[PDB]
Write a protein that binds this DNA or RNA. Structure first.
Ligand code: NA
Ligand code: NA
Ligand code: NA
Ligand code: NA
Lengths: 117, 117, 117
RNA sequence: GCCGAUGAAUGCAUGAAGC
RNA sequence: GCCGAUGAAUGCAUGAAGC
RNA sequence: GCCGAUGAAUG
RNA sequence: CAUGAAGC
């Protein structure tokens, strides 16, 4: 689909777990509208995009945009899992990390692992 | 009606305030069904009957039963107010106090005011 | 799956024919709830279990129990056919023969063919 | 939101009707 | 027509939840 | 319970 | 456009 590279589930789980952790020591935007706004304003440190989005055009612009902004993005399998990770009661098509908090190093590890694809 | 005497509203509010006060340090049975059971078993110390109960036949037996069991009963105007007094979320057609808790003396005063009719 | 032996469709049709014929001179329990109670009460002479039960935990306990109660059980293909055989309007997951009626000998032949498996 | 002491869930009995 | 033995109407125990 | 980040209430 | 978890 609108997917520009495959992502290992090891990495996926690493990322989602990091997203939960950032929620308490950092800042996160959740939902495509917020995330697009964040990337546009150049606040996004790592953006998450779910792969099971129907219709696709809802997240279709996000990979293209992140790459023009040279903002790292990473894909995850289910929007349900991303909804759970940002701490909401509904599925979440995309999200983003805006302020890392204390997790300077973990996020460094993860974004570096993402370039490797 | 099934009403055998009018009750000064002073007496009524004293009764209701008493009932909330008992809810937490003593024992109260709520609903016509539980109430009738308490009276039948000789456990009821004071029963409350709402006057606005329709159909009346739902609480009609309670006065007569109390009188053959020598249980003091008192009438109150609204079942809504009685529900609120026993701390349930719906109106309550009748209720009963089974264990006075610490509020022995006030209960004496109230039953005495009831005898006065 | 709860199926503990294969049953020849020859035997299955025999058993269902016997069940239709008894529902008229004997007694039959129909539906898992009733049938289980009948087995637990030690009244069941033969229990029928449909194989196409979804989810299986509805009838899964029945073999173990019949085994504890020394009750013969026999398996059949469809819950619809079992519903039809006990004479009801909906599919039937399990049933039991409680009183053989006139069919002492036939029910004996059938329980015998069942030991052979 | 709705529903519930004018009796919720539940338990036990029942077991083909209900709308 | 829909629904129902994968349990309808129901009786009783019970008493604050259920959706 | 239904609904809601595929965006609630709102401005 | 702004805001972003409630509303019923
Ligand atoms: Na035996
Ligand atoms: Na069929
Ligand atoms: Na029941
Ligand atoms: Na009932």
């Amino acid at each position: 689909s609108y997917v520009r590279f495959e992502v290992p589930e090891d990495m996926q789980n690493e990322a989602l777990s990091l997203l939960e952790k950032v929620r308490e020591s950092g800042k996160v935007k959740k939902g495509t509208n917020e995330t697009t706004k964040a990337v546009e304003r150049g606040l996004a440190k790592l953006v998450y995009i779910a792969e099971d989005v129907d219709p696709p055009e809802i997240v279709a612009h996000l990979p293209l945009l992140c790459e023009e902004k040279n903002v790292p993005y990473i894909y995850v399998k289910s929007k349900n899992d991303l909804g759970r990770a940002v701490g909401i009661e509904v599925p979440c098509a995309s999200a983003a990390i805006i302020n890392e908090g204390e997790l300077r190093k973990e996020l460094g590890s993860l974004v570096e692992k993402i370039k490797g694809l």
